[PDB]
Short mmCIF file of N, CA and C and ligand atoms in Angstrom, two decimals:
data_model
loop_
_atom_site.label_atom_id
_atom_site.label_comp_id
_atom_site.label_asym_id
_atom_site.label_seq_id
_atom_site.Cartn_x
_atom_site.Cartn_y
_atom_site.Cartn_z
N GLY A 1 189.84 5.13 46.30
CA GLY A 1 189.60 5.20 47.22
C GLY A 1 189.80 3.72 46.62
N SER A 2 189.48 2.63 47.38
CA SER A 2 189.38 1.67 48.82
C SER A 2 188.60 0.09 48.96
N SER A 3 188.21 0.11 48.09
CA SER A 3 187.74 -0.71 48.77
C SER A 3 186.66 -2.33 48.11
N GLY A 4 186.28 -3.83 48.95
CA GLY A 4 185.63 -4.36 48.40
C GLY A 4 185.98 -5.46 49.56
N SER A 5 184.52 -5.67 50.19
CA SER A 5 184.44 -7.23 51.21
C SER A 5 183.18 -7.86 50.46
N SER A 6 183.66 -8.40 49.52
CA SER A 6 182.65 -9.09 49.03
C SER A 6 183.09 -11.16 48.41
N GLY A 7 182.99 -11.59 49.76
CA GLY A 7 184.22 -12.36 49.69
C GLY A 7 185.05 -13.07 50.71
N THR A 8 183.86 -13.31 51.77
CA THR A 8 184.92 -13.33 53.22
C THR A 8 184.16 -14.40 53.36
N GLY A 9 184.80 -15.70 53.21
CA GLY A 9 184.10 -16.87 53.87
C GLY A 9 183.18 -17.81 53.45
N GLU A 10 181.78 -17.72 52.97
CA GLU A 10 181.31 -18.42 52.53
C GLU A 10 179.45 -18.05 52.80
N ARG A 11 178.34 -17.55 51.80
CA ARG A 11 177.83 -16.52 51.99
C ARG A 11 176.87 -17.82 52.90
N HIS A 12 176.16 -17.71 53.24
CA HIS A 12 174.63 -18.70 53.75
C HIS A 12 173.56 -18.04 53.77
N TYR A 13 172.42 -18.71 54.08
CA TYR A 13 171.09 -19.23 54.13
C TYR A 13 170.33 -17.53 55.65
N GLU A 14 169.56 -17.39 55.17
CA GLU A 14 169.82 -16.19 56.30
C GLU A 14 167.65 -16.40 56.23
N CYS A 15 166.99 -16.17 57.46
CA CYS A 15 165.28 -16.46 57.07
C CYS A 15 165.21 -15.03 56.72
N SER A 16 164.50 -14.86 55.69
CA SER A 16 163.69 -13.36 55.83
C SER A 16 162.47 -12.94 55.75
N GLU A 17 162.38 -13.97 57.52
CA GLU A 17 161.02 -13.26 57.95
C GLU A 17 161.03 -12.69 59.14
N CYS A 18 162.04 -13.01 59.84
CA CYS A 18 163.27 -13.13 60.89
C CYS A 18 163.78 -11.91 61.17
N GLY A 19 164.73 -12.85 60.48
CA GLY A 19 165.59 -12.16 60.28
C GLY A 19 167.04 -13.33 60.44
N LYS A 20 166.47 -14.50 61.29
CA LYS A 20 168.00 -15.47 61.79
C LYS A 20 168.93 -15.49 60.22
N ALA A 21 170.42 -17.19 60.39
CA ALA A 21 171.05 -16.48 59.95
C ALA A 21 171.68 -18.61 59.96
N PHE A 22 171.18 -19.89 58.81
CA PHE A 22 172.25 -20.69 58.43
C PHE A 22 173.27 -20.98 57.57
N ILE A 23 173.79 -21.82 57.98
CA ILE A 23 174.57 -22.35 57.41
C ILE A 23 174.62 -23.44 55.53
N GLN A 24 173.21 -24.25 55.41
CA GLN A 24 172.92 -24.87 55.05
C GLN A 24 171.25 -24.26 54.77
N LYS A 25 170.90 -24.66 53.67
CA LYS A 25 169.27 -23.11 52.78
C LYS A 25 168.43 -24.59 53.48
N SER A 26 168.96 -26.38 53.24
CA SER A 26 167.57 -26.89 53.35
C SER A 26 167.69 -26.89 55.13
N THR A 27 168.16 -26.60 56.23
CA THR A 27 168.20 -26.62 56.85
C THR A 27 166.89 -25.07 57.53
N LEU A 28 167.06 -24.29 56.81
CA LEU A 28 166.47 -22.73 57.05
C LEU A 28 165.19 -23.13 56.62
N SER A 29 164.87 -23.78 55.70
CA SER A 29 163.10 -23.95 55.65
C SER A 29 162.70 -24.50 56.33
N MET A 30 163.74 -25.61 57.03
CA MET A 30 162.49 -26.44 57.94
C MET A 30 162.32 -25.55 59.47
N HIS A 31 163.44 -24.11 58.85
CA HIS A 31 162.65 -22.66 60.55
C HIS A 31 161.86 -21.92 59.97
N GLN A 32 161.70 -21.68 58.52
CA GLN A 32 161.18 -20.90 57.87
C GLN A 32 159.52 -21.42 57.91
N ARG A 33 159.49 -22.61 58.63
CA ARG A 33 158.08 -22.93 57.79
C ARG A 33 157.19 -22.47 59.18
N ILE A 34 158.31 -22.26 60.80
CA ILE A 34 157.35 -21.60 61.53
C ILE A 34 156.60 -20.63 60.77
N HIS A 35 157.23 -20.06 60.50
CA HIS A 35 155.53 -18.85 59.39
C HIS A 35 155.27 -18.72 58.66
N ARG A 36 155.54 -20.24 58.39
CA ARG A 36 153.78 -20.05 56.98
C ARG A 36 152.85 -20.92 57.99
N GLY A 37 151.64 -20.30 57.32
CA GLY A 37 150.40 -20.30 58.22
C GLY A 37 149.48 -18.80 58.17
N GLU A 38 148.87 -17.50 58.63
CA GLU A 38 148.44 -17.36 58.22
C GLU A 38 148.54 -15.81 59.56
N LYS A 39 148.32 -14.77 58.48
CA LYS A 39 149.08 -13.37 59.03
C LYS A 39 147.59 -12.32 58.87
N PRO A 40 148.61 -11.59 60.37
CA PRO A 40 147.44 -10.50 61.16
C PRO A 40 146.44 -9.68 59.66
N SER A 41 145.88 -8.36 59.71
CA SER A 41 145.50 -7.84 58.66
C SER A 41 146.46 -7.04 58.33
N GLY A 42 146.58 -6.37 59.52
CA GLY A 42 147.42 -5.60 58.85
C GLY A 42 147.13 -3.39 59.84
N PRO A 43 146.60 -2.88 59.60
CA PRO A 43 146.26 -2.05 59.82
C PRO A 43 145.65 -2.75 61.77
N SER A 44 145.97 -2.77 62.48
CA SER A 44 144.96 -3.63 62.89
C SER A 44 145.83 -2.12 64.04
N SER A 45 144.69 -1.64 64.88
CA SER A 45 144.79 -0.95 65.15
C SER A 45 144.34 -0.21 67.41
N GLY A 46 145.03 -0.98 67.89
CA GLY A 46 145.09 -1.37 69.18
C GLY A 46 145.44 -3.15 69.15
ZN1 ZN B 1 161.98 -17.05 61.08
#
């Protein structure tokens, strides 16, 4: 076999809440904030 696609370009910091992608880490934090806050119970039925 032949594979190895780990090293083409430059890693990036993408959000883990929504799934957005950013070039810089700090820049991402400024966004992730939007997620910072309260969250729903979960079992919300309806
Ligand atoms: Zn996000």
